Amino acid sequence: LADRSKIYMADLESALHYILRIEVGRFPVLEGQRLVALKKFVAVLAKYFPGRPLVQNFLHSVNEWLKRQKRNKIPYSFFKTALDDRKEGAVLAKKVNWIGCQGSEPHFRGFPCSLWVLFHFLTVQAARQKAKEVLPAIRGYVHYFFGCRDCASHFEQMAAASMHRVGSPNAAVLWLWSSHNRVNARLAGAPSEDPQFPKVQWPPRELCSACHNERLDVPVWDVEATLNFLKAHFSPSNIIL
Numbered sequence: 001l002a003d004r005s006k007i008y009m010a011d012l013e014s015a016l017h018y019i020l021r022i023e024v025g026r027f028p029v030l031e032g033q034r035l036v037a038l039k040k041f042v043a044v045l046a047k048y049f050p051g052r053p054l055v056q057n058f059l060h061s062v063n064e065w066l067k068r069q070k071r072n073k074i075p076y077s078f079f080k081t082a083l084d085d086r087k088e089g090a091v092l093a094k095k096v097n098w099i100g101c102q103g104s105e106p107h108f109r110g111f112p113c114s115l116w117v118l119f120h121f122l123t124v125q126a127a128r129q130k131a132k133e134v135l136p137a138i139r140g141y142v143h144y145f146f147g148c149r150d151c152a153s154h155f156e157q158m159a160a161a162s163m164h165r166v167g168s169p170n171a172a173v174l175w176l177w178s179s180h181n182r183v184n185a186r187l188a189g190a191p192s193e194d195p196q197f198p199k200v201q202w203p204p205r206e207l208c209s210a211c212h213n214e215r216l217d218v219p220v221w222d223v224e225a226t227l228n229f230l231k232a233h234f235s236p237s238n239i240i241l
């Protein structure tokens with residue numbers, strides 16, 4: 001019975017944990033563009049993740065450690081040691097804990113849900129203002145580290161198709177939002193859909209009524225109202241600690 005209108009810090013910190021210990025850990029060696037993508041994304045986290053003091057200090061420490069590695073190749077084992085030295089387990093957690101991303105069954109929702117939330121939050125933080133590097137950094141992360149390539153593939157299809165049209169932080173926020181809805185549409189009512197959390201064109205009317213237009217002559221979404229709702233929804237004040 002989580003509040004669909006809130007953001008739970010637990011989902012965000014679990015996402016970070018999963019990213020650093022699981023997704024990045026799938027590669028014995030981090031090099032080339034994958035390493036560049038990791039550094040750009042961590043730089044984005046260090047600056048835009050809405051973390052508590054200990055977590056923000058942790059991200060800055062990891063960010064700086066990465067910036068110092070002059071080498072072109074970084075063994076994951078070496079990165080794991082850096083995480084351990086910076087007590088990520090104490091700062092974040094040992095096991096994931098989903099609240100707003102809790103699937104009705106283990107295989108439903110979870111990390112993928114937390115990743116979307118994290119991504120949207122990063123775009124909004126950048127718009128309540130490097131900033132221009134948020135969406136590319138997110139694209140970079142999805143391409144080089146995101147587990148389910150099925151999930152990834154569909155995201156990259158959208159990026160090349162239009163991510164290049166994004167010319168501002170606000171546009172980037174809306175781009176990710178609408179791109180997420182295009183994914184929602186294809187997944188709606190699918191055999192893989194969590195029955196307890198049906199896919200819909202988000203935000204639904206009960207969440208944001210002004211975001212929705214009435215005429216079949218005017219667009220479905222009120223882009224201005226939607227932008228404001230997004231800035232309000234993905235904000236530090238809307239996070240439950």
Ligand SMILES: Cc1cc2nc3c(=O)[nH]c(=O)nc-3n(C[C@H](O)[C@H](O)[C@H](O)COP(=O)(O)OP(=O)(O)OC[C@H]3O[C@@H](n4cnc5c(N)ncnc54)[C@H](O)[C@@H]3O)c2cc1C
Pocket residue numbers: 004100101108109110112113114115116117120142150151152153154155176177178179180181183184187192194197198199202203
């Ligand atoms: C880049 C990317 C590509 C993916 N591609 C696929 C794929 O091709 N196939 C497949 O099976 N799975 C894919 N997934 C997974 C999928 O999108 C879901 O994350 C998953 O099915 C869990 O769905 P969910 O219902 O819990 O909510 P999610 O879609 O994970 O949503 C997280 C939450 O964010 C909010 N939200 C919903 N829509 C929006 C929106 N438009 N804008 C802002 N916030 C929103 C809601 O509060 C919701 O509970 C992908 C994930 C990512 C991050």
